[PDB]
Structure formats: structure tokens, C-alpha cells
Amino acid sequence: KTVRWCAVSEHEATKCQSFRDHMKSVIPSDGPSVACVKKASYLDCIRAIAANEADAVTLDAGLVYDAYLAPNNLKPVVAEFYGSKEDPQTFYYAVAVVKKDSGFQMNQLRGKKSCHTGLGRSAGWNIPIGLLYCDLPEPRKPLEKAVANFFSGSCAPCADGTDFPQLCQLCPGCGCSTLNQYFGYSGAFKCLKDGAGDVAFVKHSTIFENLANKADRDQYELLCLDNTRKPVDEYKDCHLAQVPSHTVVARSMGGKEDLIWELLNQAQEHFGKDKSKEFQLFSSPHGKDLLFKDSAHGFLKVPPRMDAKMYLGYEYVTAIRNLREGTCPEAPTDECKPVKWCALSHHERLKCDEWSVNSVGKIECVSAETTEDCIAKIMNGEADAMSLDGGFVYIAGKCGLVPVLAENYNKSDNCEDTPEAGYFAVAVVKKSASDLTWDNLKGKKSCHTAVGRTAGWNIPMGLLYNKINHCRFDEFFSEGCAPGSKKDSSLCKLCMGSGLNLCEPNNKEGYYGYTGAFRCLVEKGDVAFVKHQTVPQNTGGKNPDPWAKNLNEKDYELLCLDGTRKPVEEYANCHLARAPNHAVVTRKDKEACVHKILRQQQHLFGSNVTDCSGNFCLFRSETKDLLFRDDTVCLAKLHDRNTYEKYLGEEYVKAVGNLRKCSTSSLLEACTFRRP
Known part of the structure; x- marks a missing residue:
């Protein structure tokens, strides 16, 4: 019933011991307890937890990724937030701010001029360079030089001005302090404002701190990943990455996640933020951010269906993977990557296999245990597409996926271009x-x-x-x-x-x-x-x-x-x-390829050719409704109804939403936490 916390420094352990103590005083001897295991560093703490010699630690987003990788395999169990619980701030978004009508999208950044908060920083460097990675010119190592050539000139604080000059072109010397006017968040934004740089990689709230008046702000736009822009306040629906602020990880199997929640939940209660001047949980005399950032306001339990990749999020994981690995596709450049279709049953996998062979590589198959597992896979990249019914187009939508083609049933000779409504x-x-x-x-x-x-x-x-x-x-x-x-x-x-x-x-x-x-x-x-x-x-x-x-x-x-x-x-x-009718859902970044590949497939194997005898038929099933519904005539292009909110209809969404209040859905409660 005790939780072994891991501390990465003497100071932190003292604070931990205080924690342990003040938690003894009034907390039933049947209530959670704290033990303090002292380690020399985060990696050593992560390792201690996996080697069952400790139970929990709080890490930055980057170490949350590291902790998740083998052989540690740790997951997010509790989150640290920074507002009220009306607006619990647990995440933050790495955004790319630019100036209105400058005409260029994320994929048109080569040559432009960049403003980074500081080299090695998260939102300002790791994330943007991460995503941009495959667009950098080889050799991509050292990284710093490769970025120098990619951009025409930039202000990369703390970079090696000496060896790769163009990185301080917007701020000579590359001072790594407030002395250099273009250092840090505001420093980078100003670099953009002063017009030295075309794009500034900062936090979502960064612009809201350098421009008090909406008027002036309205002059700035944010680059989105689907190569489109949007108003600076629409960051939640347009960012380079969503980063957890501060997270508490545990083992994936075992791990005492629940017990941990029972500890910190109570802890934040007896020593929350005002709760007491006897012992402050989010501060200490020995230092700052010991055990937990000082800026913290409280804790939140993380929905169990969640794993690091889900928590960190697609974009984030993508960025870090590239940096961590460095692996690009010197394959074509435009030719669509095969669509991985997720199968739910043995019979689905079998039909998908027959389909994959006949498509000659344009279609591939992946097997998951349940519809929700498929959705998690389309979510994290292990899978690209699958057809869902209303209830799941809703769930999938809360998770960021989007409806791309709807299954059509009636009025048969005009099919391909007229989505049925229901x-x-x-x-x-x-x-x-x-x-x-x-x-x-x-x-x-x-x-x-x-x-x-x-x-x-x-x-x-x-x-x-x-x-x-x-x-x-x-x-x-x-x-x-x-x-x-x-x-x-x-x-x-x-x-x-x-x-x-x-x-x-x-x-x-x-x-x-x-x-x-x-x-x-x-x-x-x-x-x-x-x-x-x-x-x-x-x-x-x-x-x-x-x-x-x-x-x-x-x-x-x-x-x-x-x-x-x-x-x-x-x-x-x-x-x-x-x-509604069943719709194919997929990730925003694959939406284009799914349209091209499926139209060409429903062409070759659609309801058109009825010789299912000596060849393949996309809409007939050995069993019943495998992959699609048998009464499917074609897959319609959801032209503008390409979002669950625009495809389902307010009334329907209102209802389904209300019902999921009654019937849980672990996957939904998880996607809700990351966003809704």
C-alpha cells in the first residue's frame, strides 16, 4: 500500500522525505504512504521503476518518450496541471507563428528565415526540426549544419555561431541569454515581429504574451501540418505538436497506477496550493521544481486506456522519432504510400488479404483486437484506414481522425459523387x-x-x-x-x-x-x-x-x-x-492517399464487375459485411463534410455524446482528456 517515489537529487529527496512525513500525520494508517528512493538521474529513475526498485517519477515530455521505449515500457498515470480545474492546463502546443499573407506553408519552409527560442529547446527546436527532418539536405549529421543549409538564415540561440554562421544571421553571436534580443520565447517572436525572420517556432501562448491587442495579433497566422494556415487562437486545431507539461509515469504491467493516484490525489488535497502553509507540495525552500514543477496547481488521473504514444500524440512522436532515429524515404516523393487497412476479425483479415494481393500492393492489412484498438492504431500510425459506423465515427473524431469517404447504399447510377445523409x-x-x-x-x-x-x-x-x-x-x-x-x-x-x-x-x-x-x-x-x-x-x-x-x-x-x-x-x-452511413476514417495526413487509392480500388473491384466468381469483389463477404457493408454501392467523396462534426450532424452528435455518458468507452475517455 506504499509508493516508492524516485528522486534525482539530494534536495529532491529531502523534499520527498518531508512529503513522506507530512503524509503520515492524519492519513489513516490504511491510506497511501511514501517511500523515497534516491537515484542519480532521470534515466536511472526510469530504470529503477522498470526494475521494480521504485514506482513513480515525474518527467518532461521527452523523457516520457524515453521511458516508454523498451525495455522500460513505462506509461503516464497522473498529470500535473497549471490553471484552475475549470481550465486545467496540462498540455501546451508547439506552434509555428508567421506573418499574415506571407504565402507559404510548412512544406514550403526551405529557403525561408527562421526564429528559434533556443537550440535544444522543445517547441523552439526539437519539434520543428524533428518534423522538418526529412526535408533537410544530406548529410543530416551534424544536425546543426543541415538546418543551417535548409533555412536561408535564422536566429538559433546557443547554436555554434563559429562553425555554422547562418544560424546567428538574425542574431549574431547566438547569445544564449536575454542579452541577445532574439533569445527565448519572446525573443524569438520579436525576431518575427521585427521582420528579421519569416517564421518563429514558439509556444501557442507565446504571441498572447507579446501582443496585448487582438488587433495587432490578427496580423499573425499559424502554420498547420496539413499545409494550411489559421488564426493564432485556433492553435488547438493547428500546431506542430501537443506536449504534456509534466507527467508521472509508472510500469505498464504492475506499476501501482491506482495506488499512485490515491496518494497524489490526497496529497494535493492536504497540501494543494493554499491547502496549507505547513507543507507546500508545489514548492520548497531547498529549491525549485523539486519532485514536481512549482508552477503546478494540481493533479489529474490519466485514463487507463492510454499509452505513451497516445499521450504524447502522433505529431510529437513523429518529430522525436526522426530526431532519435533519422530515417527518410528516398523513395519516389509523391507516389502514394500503400494504405494499411485494419481488420477486426479473422474473417476480416482473410478478406483483406485477398484484397491486398489483388490490389497489388496499394492495400496492406493490419490486425487489431477490437474496433477501438484499430482506432488507436490509425491514430498512432500502425494503421491508416477502416470503415466505421456513426458511433465510432464520433469516437474516432474525438480522437482526431476524420471521415474521408462515406458508404453509399441507394440511388445507384450517380453514386461516386453524392454523399448520402441518412x-x-x-x-x-x-x-x-x-x-x-x-x-x-x-x-x-x-x-x-x-x-x-x-x-x-x-x-x-x-x-x-x-x-x-x-x-x-x-x-x-x-x-x-x-x-x-x-x-x-x-x-x-x-x-x-x-x-x-x-x-x-x-x-x-x-x-x-x-x-x-x-x-x-x-x-x-x-x-x-x-x-x-x-x-x-x-x-x-x-x-x-x-x-x-x-x-x-x-x-x-x-x-x-x-x-x-x-x-x-x-x-x-x-x-x-x-x-448516418458507415464512413472510412483515416488520419488527416493520409486523407489524400486514401481518396486516390480507394477510388481506383472501388473501380477495379467495386459493385461494377459482378464476376465475384473468378476474381475479387470489394463489397461481397464470405461471412457478412467484411470491411464494408455488403449493400455498399460505392465510396462517396465527403467533399466538405470531412470532419465528424460536419458529417454526423449536431442532433446526432448531441445524442451519441449524451449516451457515451452512460456507456463508457475507455478509448473515448482518453481522447477526451488529451483534448475535449
Whole structure:
């Protein structure tokens, strides 16, 4: 129940011993305890933790990468933040500030003039040079010279002015102190402001400290990785890298992550930032930043699904990898790199393999255990693309990935250029129902197609969430039939079909499905949640069966979320949410290649050629829906709907968002932490 903290210096160990002590005084002898293992350096601390001779240490982003690498394999368990918990600042963004209308993007930096905070610094050197690495001229070692030739001239504080002069061209001597006006963050920004340099590599907040007036700021832009610019305040959605400020790592297996959280959580409680002048956790008389930076305000537990690569982030890991390794592709230069497609099942891997061979290298396969694991892989580069359903296009989007092509199902001869939007989920009731309105449903009787389903649950049950704020849905409706709820719940008390299949999510449950929930409306409930076509299909006699043969379309009305009502006829203006088609998602940096490669593939192996017999077919499956949905006609180009927020639709996103409040998703809670 004790946590062995690692200190990299006598001072730090003294502070640690104080920590240990003041944590004994009032903290049940059943509550966490601190032991102090003293090591000579960070690497020795990282090693101690992996060799199970210590348990935790706090490191800068760079050592968080090192700690993650074999054979240590350590992960981020607790984070240090710098604001209020309303605006807990745990990250910071390495951004590239430039002057408005100077016309050039990240990939057009050769020749330009650079301003770096200081050589060896994070945001100001390691990250930018890292990414830029493959664009530097060989020999790339020594690095300093190679950067000197890349740029036309720059101000690289602390660089070797003597040997590679052009690096102090904007600041002769390269002074490594405030003496040199272009040193440090502000020094680098000023280098840009004074117009000595074209681009200045600094922190996101750097410009917000050198220009108090939005007016002047509006004259500066930030270079983004997809070779486009954006307003300095849109840094979160345009930066070279996202860096964790200060992180606490542990072992990946074992590691006592939970115990560690229980320690520091309480610690920050008894000695938080004001909590006491007896013992200050984020400061010391013996020094500064001992154990934890002094600027700290508190701690935050890191979602368990997270690994260093996820925590550090794609861009960051990319930058550091290059520096650490140095490995470029003197391969073509423009010819698209093969698309690695992630498979979910054995049968998926098998179909993907058949596909890979037939594509002749343009398609490759990667196998992950679950949809979320595939998403983590597309996230960190181990994989590039895969098709997802609404719920996952949402999750994937929270994680930074983006929808690129949507799966099309209907109107077949115009396909390739017209993204389908979906099938409107509508709430239904009988016109002969008393004033029933959207915001009136409480205590009513419900009819659902089945729990978990989109049109009959997630969407409706998802919007209704803002009218409760708790996940106990069975106790909102007086009663109802929701195939799948617990056999006893109120959601099961209106379901017919007896025996073992009472309230079961299969057709043996009469009230199951679209048609089934309608019958459930007609025979026991006042509200049914289906889709826009469900009624026209089950009226006008279009349905033989007893209970339906005489039902008439006009005897019903679908509820509109603004309280009013409208005719089943114009569902288009009175639905709950749209409900999308499956979409291929991929990383922003691979978006281009995915379009080119897939269009050419759906060409060669699409629904076009029907001789699936003696050749390959992208849309047919040995099993069922492998890789794509079998009823897929083509992959549409999501022209401008290329972001989950623009492809899903506010209503849908609102709902799905609300539901993930009830059903966790470790991957989502992790991506949320890094950004949302």
C-alpha cells in the first residue's frame, strides 16, 4: 500500500522525505504512504521503476518518450496541471507563428528565415526540426549544419555561431541569454515581429504574451501540418505538436497506477496550493521544481486506456522519432504510400488479404483486437484506414481522425459523387393521442426497436437525456417494450411473445424491430421510435398481417423536438436526428492517399464487375459485411463534410455524446482528456 517515489537529487529527496512525513500525520494508517528512493538521474529513475526498485517519477515530455521505449515500457498515470480545474492546463502546443499573407506553408519552409527560442529547446527546436527532418539536405549529421543549409538564415540561440554562421544571421553571436534580443520565447517572436525572420517556432501562448491587442495579433497566422494556415487562437486545431507539461509515469504491467493516484490525489488535497502553509507540495525552500514543477496547481488521473504514444500524440512522436532515429524515404516523393487497412476479425483479415494481393500492393492489412484498438492504431500510425459506423465515427473524431469517404447504399447510377445523409429517425404517436409532444413523454408508454439500436434507442433515448441527467432509462417511461432491457425492467413489461423470448432482441419477439415497435404503438403504447419510412410501409394495406392490414397512414403523427407536431408525410422537417452511413476514417495526413487509392480500388473491384466468381469483389463477404457493408454501392467523396462534426450532424452528435455518458468507452475517455 506504499509508493516508492524516485528522486534525482539530494534536495529532491529531502523534499520527498518531508512529503513522506507530512503524509503520515492524519492519513489513516490504511491510506497511501511514501517511500523515497534516491537515484542519480532521470534515466536511472526510469530504470529503477522498470526494475521494480521504485514506482513513480515525474518527467518532461521527452523523457516520457524515453521511458516508454523498451525495455522500460513505462506509461503516464497522473498529470500535473497549471490553471484552475475549470481550465486545467496540462498540455501546451508547439506552434509555428508567421506573418499574415506571407504565402507559404510548412512544406514550403526551405529557403525561408527562421526564429528559434533556443537550440535544444522543445517547441523552439526539437519539434520543428524533428518534423522538418526529412526535408533537410544530406548529410543530416551534424544536425546543426543541415538546418543551417535548409533555412536561408535564422536566429538559433546557443547554436555554434563559429562553425555554422547562418544560424546567428538574425542574431549574431547566438547569445544564449536575454542579452541577445532574439533569445527565448519572446525573443524569438520579436525576431518575427521585427521582420528579421519569416517564421518563429514558439509556444501557442507565446504571441498572447507579446501582443496585448487582438488587433495587432490578427496580423499573425499559424502554420498547420496539413499545409494550411489559421488564426493564432485556433492553435488547438493547428500546431506542430501537443506536449504534456509534466507527467508521472509508472510500469505498464504492475506499476501501482491506482495506488499512485490515491496518494497524489490526497496529497494535493492536504497540501494543494493554499491547502496549507505547513507543507507546500508545489514548492520548497531547498529549491525549485523539486519532485514536481512549482508552477503546478494540481493533479489529474490519466485514463487507463492510454499509452505513451497516445499521450504524447502522433505529431510529437513523429518529430522525436526522426530526431532519435533519422530515417527518410528516398523513395519516389509523391507516389502514394500503400494504405494499411485494419481488420477486426479473422474473417476480416482473410478478406483483406485477398484484397491486398489483388490490389497489388496499394492495400496492406493490419490486425487489431477490437474496433477501438484499430482506432488507436490509425491514430498512432500502425494503421491508416477502416470503415466505421456513426458511433465510432464520433469516437474516432474525438480522437482526431476524420471521415474521408462515406458508404453509399441507394440511388445507384450517380453514386461516386453524392454523399448520402441518412434515414431520419422519427418519433411516432397516434393523432388521437392527447396533446402528446416531445417534451411531454415522461411517464408515458414507450415502444423501441431494441436497446442499443440507432433509430429506436440511441438517437431518441439520447436527446431525452437532457431531460433527466442520469442513466436509469427504464424509470422515465411508465412502461414499455425495449427488446434487450433486463427481463424485469419496465422496458420489458409491454413486450409480447412469451416463453424464453419474452422481450428478446429477435423476431420471435413480436414487438421487436421497426415494424415490431409500430405494432407495439398500435397495440399498447403511445410513442414509437422508428425511421421515416416505417409507417408508409406499414399502412395503406402495404402490410397484409392482421393487426396492420387496416391501419391508415394519416391516423398518425411524428413528434418534432421543438414541441410541435407534423404529418408522417414530411418527416424531412420533423425528425429527431439523421442517422448516418458507415464512413472510412483515416488520419488527416493520409486523407489524400486514401481518396486516390480507394477510388481506383472501388473501380477495379467495386459493385461494377459482378464476376465475384473468378476474381475479387470489394463489397461481397464470405461471412457478412467484411470491411464494408455488403449493400455498399460505392465510396462517396465527403467533399466538405470531412470532419465528424460536419458529417454526423449536431442532433446526432448531441445524442451519441449524451449516451457515451452512460456507456463508457475507455478509448473515448482518453481522447477526451488529451483534448475535449
